[model samples]
Target: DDLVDAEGNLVENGGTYYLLPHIWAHGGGIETAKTGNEPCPLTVVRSPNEVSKGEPIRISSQFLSLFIPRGSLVALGFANPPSCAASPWATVVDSPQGPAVKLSQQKLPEKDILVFKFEKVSHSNIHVYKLLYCQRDDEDVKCDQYIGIHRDRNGNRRLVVTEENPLELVLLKAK
Candidate 1:
């Protein structure tokens, strides 16, 4: 459903999928908004169902790494690009706003994979989901938070926090 591409393929556990901005596709998004400006939105979620889905970008398999490396981080891009949806990659760094997500091509050591969890926000919508940034340390799940967004000075929309953040929303595959 959501996980299938515009090509209509099953996005399996290790398959690649685009995080298309479901609602903003018609309005606008980071591409349309100037840096420091906001691409307006409402809240929903993520998954695959004739909509959206994400197989982990990180893999534990030795056969052939298909997912993204844990170093480069996550980004919002087109299904293919050089293709600026070809944004390359991202790296998280500290910022005045808080822990900031910045775009980078080189993979650095840090948290790149996220724990995608299911949420029941809609009745008939099976693709609704939320993300969690849990811990790998002694504090466990208490050390992190769900993702939110913030527009940095560079005109880049970076991931921020859930509290006091804009509508932390995503939809299944957006066309």
Candidate 2:
């Protein structure tokens, strides 16, 4: 269970977030679907279904409250789909312009981490969940796949991000 005080601040003050499998329950790119279901393999198309359905998936990783001494930055990216997969299939080019975060592809067994943080304001809703990234080629038209939504809870909706990339978000200070 997530922690909270009588006033509603997250208990212990902090936590770790990880993006795991169920985060892509609907699947990443059509070809990336473990099940061969997509009729088209090359042409880029939006998923008929929303991945994670606007919820965060549970993860094996957790934050070490004491060790995570400061604000943390997480990196998230996908392994390059194999050659057989289409470029558009994995990377979306229509990302926004600005200082772009670099998602470096690494050797096998390596996983990409997307950096996201809880911007506390009020009410329980996730506004900026997906980390919009752009390829060096196309900076404005297409977007890399919209990763998972923050679904950043107020430590109340543990049911959402608790399934796959279960986030243990601790609200430091509350209004």
Candidate 3:
């Protein structure tokens, strides 16, 4: 299926994902171009076919690789049409087994030994994300963070600890 949106941007499930920076002016919300600059659109990348959850996924874009740092917030979901995708944002936390990415709004009971039940995006393809950091902190900031995949420089294989952002874009299928 054609995934590109009307504006020549890639979208999934008929929605566009954006990384909205924390806006502290006039009550802190993701500012559309209506208030300030504009939220940065998130880009998607594919993960390896046979990988475990919490393991770092590989990406194919070089530009998107530059913005991600170790501790950046990673979120995944289908954005509501005519509504912002930043809501119901979840934090990807680390557990003893590996990283535990979950919905921030959902509550959970601890597993016996932190067994992570990972859901995959599509059986046909692997999925991952990258981040775009916000350059400014105004009410209308231009961008928040770019989310996509990071293909390493050598191109033969990916890296474990990325140069700047050590946090990897761990993929988890949305329940």
Candidate 4:
């Protein structure tokens, strides 16, 4: 395991890679590098566990609506679920570098709820952060992409960016 891929390759010694969870955890992922740089497939070809480049954010029910609007365009990346182990969620790789964990992609009703939570963590660089969350799948499985600027020292965990412009890569905000 010396040579490997920063994402899905076999790196010797040790490198970054993505891992998928057998069960749906509140916050779960694969055995990849970090947990905020790349997008990992949540499952092992089981349910719909994929966060593509551009996907729209939605929610199953309107009972729980937070940061993102009821129907807004945000980002998606496989991240650690919440305190449980069966949540439909993911995050945006802001300052992490590795392969994705989730694999399968699930289809859902139009009324399904897609929840997204913003959390902050330590990184290798001192200029970038991660913007991630749990998303709800659509019947047609139609998703969009939302690009934005990821900054550190913001003193708060929030979605600073919303539109992908020149295409930004979340830098590692080294601690």
Better of 3 and 4 by TM-score: 4
Q: Can you tell me which runs of candidate 1 are displaced by over 4 Å?
A: 1-11, 21-91, 110-126, 138-143, 152-156, 166-175
Where's the lowest-lDDT run of ten residues in candidate 4?
Answer: 166-175
Question: For candidate 2, what's the RMSD?
Answer: 13.3
**Each model's TM-score?**
0.44, 0.24, 0.22, 0.23
Candidate 3, position 150, lDDT: 31
lDDT of 4 by residue, 1-175 (tens): 1111224222211112232221233122221121233244232111122331222112122223322232333323233332222343333323332212222234433233233322222433321223233444553333343323222242211222244221222211111
Best by TM-score: 1
Alpha-carbon shift of residue 73 in model 1 (angstroms): 13
**lDDT of each residue in 1-175, candidate 1, tens digit only:** 2232234333333443434333443222222221222222111122213332432222121123343332212333223222221142322344456654433333433344222222223432334323334444432434245555554455444555555343323333333
Question: What is the overall TM-score of model 2 with all chains considered together?
Answer: 0.24
The number of clashing residue pairs in model 3 is 16
**Candidate 3: which stretches are off by over 4 Å?**
1-87, 91-102, 106-130, 140-175
Error of 3 at 139 (Å): 3.7
- Which residue window of length 10 is worst by lDDT in model 3? 26-35
Residue 100 in candidate 2, Cα distance off native in Å: 7.2
